Design a protein around this ligand. Structure first.
Ligand SMILES: Nc1nc2c(ncn2[C@@H]2O[C@H](COP(=O)(O)OP(=O)(O)O)[C@@H](O)[C@H]2O)c(=O)[nH]1
Ligand SMILES: Nc1nc2c(ncn2[C@@H]2O[C@H](COP(=O)(O)OP(=O)(O)O)[C@@H](O)[C@H]2O)c(=O)[nH]1
Lengths: 163, 165
């Protein structure tokens, strides 16, 4: 079993907490408090890769916390909301921050969350894909609400990590 | 440069959480008044860069550990209070330190306050047990008196110095 630390980043309300709860606990409850209720949570994927997952919900404003959150992190997911263009712009700022401040070996994924609300889409799939490709990022659209692509994002990260 | 943070107070009922908050925020103490800060939260600052605290009291809510998600969400600091005249309160402070370490952001700054230190002629919690305990858990520690204001401002100052700039 390989075990790694993974951090979730992104604007408040994009779905960071929901994504971690869906992956770790299997479930979703709408309008819950925006937190994972735990200092960190753990879950695995079999190829076995075990993730210790740190959420930044409630802490998004505090970029000087970066040293602590990124120390010993092997992976990160930057999350945006596909219905909110500003959150995609914001995601780029965190991708940049990871690139400048996290370990040079960190595996970064971008998640376009709330893809169940594709009718209210404001960030084009092809736009985020090009951006992800330009930055050597993993990219998927996700829905914590339905579970669409949630486990599979963590699996894609697991495959990119060292053995 | 005003950094503003959220701070939560934990500890057994009657240790002095509400008194400590009112002393820092309003400057004053009134003995035997209701165990509440009379506000959803209160704000006060410390100048170093000015650090502003939005302070949540748990007085009246101590039983309900299931509220922790809401209280700890977006919190950057916490103070766990005990009463230096009451050993069970110190034993209890350890339970809340453990709850914060398990359930709050890993980045949270945690302080330990031995309150009612003005009643040193009724002391039952050894300062050295408390200090050793604080050291083992990477906590800030001071004894305080909401009643006289001894060390109350300086406790929040010490927390402010440890928080991110
Ligand atoms: N429709 C939809 N709502 C979601 C999704 N993920 C999260 N939410 C909701 O969006 C709000 C914010 O989610 P939350 O996980 O707390 O975001 P966080 O602040 O980034 O941790 C809550 O009401 C969630 O239930 C999703 O994939 N689809
Ligand atoms: N002697 C003394 N009494 C205090 C001190 N702090 C609080 N008290 C008193 O202890 C009682 C409980 O305090 P309170 O602040 O309501 O505790 P809380 O339930 O933790 O909010 C009240 O009668 C306070 O006036 C202190 O530093 N010294």
């Amino acid at each position: 079993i390989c075990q790694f630390k993974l951090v979730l980043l992104g604007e408040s309300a994009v779905g960071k907490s929901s994504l971690v709860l869906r992956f770790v606990k299997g479930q979703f409850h709408e309008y819950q408090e925006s937190t994972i209720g735990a200092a960190f949570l753990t879950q695995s994927v079999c190829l076995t890769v075990k993730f210790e997952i740190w959420d930044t919900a409630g802490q998004e404003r505090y970029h000087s916390l970066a040293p602590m959150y990124y120390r010993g992190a092997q992976a990160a997911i930057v999350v945006y909301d596909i219905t909110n263009q500003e959150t995609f712009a914001r995601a780029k700022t965190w991708v940049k921050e990871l690139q400048r401040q996290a370990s040079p070996s960190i595996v970064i994924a971008l998640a376009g969350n709330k893809a169940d609300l594709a009718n209210k889409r404001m960030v084009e799939y092809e736009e985020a894909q090009a951006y992800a490709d330009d930055n050597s990022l993993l990219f998927m659209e996700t829905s914590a609400k339905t579970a669409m692509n949630v486990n599979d994002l963590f699996l894609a990260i697991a495959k990119k990590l060292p053995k």
